Symmetry: C5
Subunit: 310 residues, 5 copies
């Protein structure tokens, strides 16, 4: 039994995160636990303060018409819990439910682990005989609790995009609001834990340039290679899967390339040394001791700018 | 209390994906979150616009007969949410529920990671005293939302196969519709991440052909073999299990074969060298330097065509 | 209010798999999704075709007495969905529910991966004041849909054991039916993927018999041993846990034993060589080159016959 | 509306395992699927066989008072299914529900994998105006079905501790029964699969005592060490986490200790050999060949007795 | 229909843990299973002992007004089970529900594995027309059962912070109580299992200082490095992820640094030895034999005090 007038029905909305948690780099989901507040005018139940004697009349949710507001990108849907319904005398209604759901918002890993992310929660509502339109009420949207935390993330802002995106769908108007939680990573623990050790084992491979022992050099470059892969296995947990070209793992790919040309160089210095041209081998080796770090530092700089300064 | 006439009851159907997600290579399932729209004529509740005054009369789902449409291939069944029921005056009914479920559609991994897939969602309905037949209404079947994404997949099309497959079952006619979501993989991130490093460590093994040091050669070919398996462990996540003959992993099997014959060759060049026939050893080695890459490039071509050009 | 007569109540039963899936080697469970059909005579609701005018009278499940048929070996119990209830005029009732559950059927891994399995679904019903007995109706038991698949299994048959096992339990008769789904594995993908590479790395270890270099030989046999264990880690997923003596893994245990005696032999050839008896060392080595493969092929044959030909 | 008399209300109880499954060494839980039978006198509904004509009067659970029996150590609580309620003429009531839950019973891993375990299921009931006391009825407690199995365990007994533990709690008496399922492990598959290979790779390390090659010896002892850790990773699944001092893993710790002193000995024999005291090196080596196995066999015996014979 | 008077409504509260379990270092959650007791005055249902004849009048929860107490930091919300409602004659009500939930309390890993933790459970209640305030009743808050256990933790205390934190929220007063479970780890099993073996493999690397064999030394330091990473993979389960600077893993980072400078030193002693300055190499080596352990023991002491003595 929807409210009736010549105007489209506006429904004021407001999310308020009590807790957010379980960001899931793999499923691209994150759980949330929040208030939802709806508010809309219904003159059919507008009432008299004086004859009834009360400032506000509460109602059970079964009793009166309530718009079908729905989340769009939510798996584990319909976890709801009505907390309050308060009808104002002029017929404005104030609905307030607690809810929680696992939202599905895609993440972009290209600048990992310096990425920022912007999680989304959509709300549609579908029209009936009246057209229906949602819109954000900022006093009740200010959705961060001070206590919200994503471990390993700094939480920038929770705000709504004030203009609803109205559109046709299966022969009805539908109105969709977009709430956005913005976050950025706590990278620094990764410097001690991921980048530095990989670099150390790479440098250990570069030691081979001061050796002429082909036996010591294969044992060097190849044993550091095994160490490299084993270490990559060790941190496999902090290197989430993407079908796209990540920053980390561009530099990883580049590191495997350095293992390969280190092996090429070692093999060359040895073939050269056995073809009785020791001067060329010692020159290629003495050269590599400068060449390898430098092309690395350069390729690292190109690569950083390509992802960040671009 | 089903509607009655001399004709079989046609029920118009339409799926509309709001979100699809959680494709699961292991369980061969994927979650979906969509509209379902059913529509069918029931003259028993056909009514008068003039005497009742309204263009359309909505009903609670308990109130009137509703066909038992059911998904066939769905674990985590019965996640339903009625959104709209609108009865036209001629007795046509328009049902619209939001639902989500994890569909069970088998995947074919033979051309991984260049595979395309075609996910399926079936709908049966079972006959009563009236025969019953489902059929697809394209205006409400156009099921892709623009926002649907399978991370790492390009989503080609969501369409329904318009002819229902009617058939006897436990002494009743049953009618089954087939909706099909079509997808194809985002392979390219795999070239930097999977294929190139395996190739580099294999080439490092081929370095042994320029060495005559049996000590350096065992250390070479066998340490690169350990590196190879360790790397395979590293990418174990991106190589899903099949009971059948995959393209990748045909080439992987072939790589293990190349490690084996490299070891055979190394051992031969060394036994030959100790039997005082150094010319045969250096000829077998100098030969291997061309033979190995070439049979590889050839075997790779045969293998590519066998899977793709066949 | 159970039906009454001087006879024990027979209830005709019939399972019909629509889908089976998620065979779980670890939990020894598998999910299923099927029809259940019950059928039994109740003269109390037998009725007149002529005075009532209809061939069959349908009933809501709340309305009439329905036997408590129950699955025995089912975790995630009670996922039910009544589809049809049709009462015949003589009082026979035809019940038909769709259901799904995860069945608990033990698997036997001794001949893995050439094993066949025979999954079980039990049905008990418990007596009241009337004795009660289940029995299988083959027209509705023919439970395979053509579309059922267990990925990596060929599905032989779905049949029921026609004689119920009646027995006393907590002072009541109980009757239990046994339905059996029979399957056999798709082994062949395992030959390229598991057996051949293990064999290659073992043969690489046998290469040591053509070397006299103790340095090269320890590096050989022990680096192939590390490769072995790393490879075992790689295929750890396809080697399910058992508390019993599996075929695969008998041969695996035997492979570790071959690494051990290869190390013993290498060490012996070297101690012999340093005790200035080179003729014994070269004889033991030249002997091993035949002895190792042959005792392997023999032990493999004994072992195959012990598990298969026994 | 509880039954009233001058006596405390005794409630006879009885669990009957239909299936037990999913023992979880990690969460320290195990799933169960059983009957529960309650029985208690209620003269308020005692009735006349002659005037009513029936030997037993069944009731719907809503209709009559039923004690709040509750499991204590259960996550995934309240999975219930009433099967029977039968009231005797003198007012004794016989309740029977099927249920399943995941019970939380701590495991003790100190003698793994020769451990036995004793799983617990508690039942409290809380007092009202009448005091209330549970007590076990053995005819309906005999809870094993013949078909119960924990894969890899032998199931000794399912019995109840007949004396309830009554106690004050939040100003009411509460009565708690303790049912106990007793089990012991199937260790033997572990001898081929875990213990023997670790021992083989350790013995391979001991081979170094017959070599004087410091190059061969480091390659030996350290490559077997890497093999060891890799093997430990391989069986990581069968070595469950404890915050306490396990038997296995005492012996593992001891094995790492043997790797360490083998390295110490090897380094010593080599420093001695370069300080031109070859006699002391060859004596320390020739000594180690007996010392290492023996201190091992001894330490293994001490360690076995400390855990088992103590 | 809330109780009315000129005063704010105080609601006495009390949690009582029956079981706590499944502490989850990864999700930073832990499950709990407890009593909740609410108590508050409602004169509207105050009653006469004499005219009604009973000391206490029990009520069904539907029948009377009950405050909306709610947990704040709880995923898997609303697992409730009313156990008792007892109204005193003066109108005080005594509510008692059993519940269980997975609480979300952040953990601090900086002093792992010597950390203590302090888990939190919050309770808000929201005001209506009356202001509403929660407060803790210690006789029913004494929440530890003697049987509570977190495996691997010693459980210090379960207490409540007696002063509620009242505050404005969405135009209502809200009152929030804070219950705190305090725990501290069982570290000692980690000394045999994690710290000692890492130290052993590190010391094995330090053996290289008594060798001048560059072949033996690369094989030494680098093979121990691989061993190190493999071992880190073995204990990866007991080293939970943090975005911050942990104590363990500061020492791990420092260990990787020692591998790196051991490689540097080895390479230097070898380049020095080939530049025909053997005295500098043997001095740097003989120096390292004291320098490495000592800077380690010092760095370990600095690092211990920085985390613990600071
Ligand atoms: Cl050399
Ligand atoms: Cl050589
Ligand atoms: Cl040698
Ligand atoms: Cl030596
Ligand atoms: Cl050297
Ligand atoms: Na890992
Ligand atoms: Na993996
Ligand atoms: Na694995
Ligand atoms: Na593992
Ligand atoms: Na691991």
């Amino acid at each position: 039994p929807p409210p009736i007038a010549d105007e489209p029905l506006t429904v004021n909305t407001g999310i308020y995160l009590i807790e957010c948690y379980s960001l899931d780099d793999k499923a691209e989901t994150f759980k949330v636990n929040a208030f939802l507040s709806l508010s809309w005018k219904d003159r059919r139940l507008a009432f008299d303060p004086v004859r009834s004697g009360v400032r506000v009349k509460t109602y059970e949710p079964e009793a009166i018409w309530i718009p079908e507001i729905r989340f769009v990108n939510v798996e584990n849907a319909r976890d709801a819990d009505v907390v309050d319904i308060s009808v104002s005398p002029d017929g404005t209604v104030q609905y307030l439910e607690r809810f929680s759901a696992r939202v599905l918002s895609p993440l972009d890993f290209r600048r990992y682990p310096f990425d920022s992310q912007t999680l989304h929660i959509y709300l549609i509502v579908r029209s009936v005989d009246t057209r229906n339109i949602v819109l954000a009420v900022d006093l009740e949207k200010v959705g961060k609790n001070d206590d919200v935390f994503l471990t390993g993330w700094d939480i920038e802002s929770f705000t709504a995009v004030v203009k609803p995106a109205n559109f046709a769908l299966e022969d009805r108007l539908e109105s969709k609001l977009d709430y956005q939680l913005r976050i950025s990573r706590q990278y620094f623990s990764y410097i001690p834990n991921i980048i530095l050790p990989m670099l150390f084992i790479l440098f250990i491979s570069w030691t081979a340039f001061w050796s002429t022992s082909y036996e010591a050099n294969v044992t060097l470059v190849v044993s550091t290679l095994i160490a490299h892969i084993a270490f990559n296995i060790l941190v496999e947990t902090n290197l989430p899967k993407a079908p796209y070209m990540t920053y980390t793992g561009a530099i990883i790919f580049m590191i495997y390339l350095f293992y390969f040309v280190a092996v090429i160089e070692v093999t060359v210095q040895h073939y050269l040394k056995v073809e009785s041209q020791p001067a060329r081998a010692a020159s290629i080796t003495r050269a590599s001791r400068i060449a390898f770090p430098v092309v690395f530092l350069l390729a690292n700089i190109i690569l950083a700018f390509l992802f960040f300064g671009f």
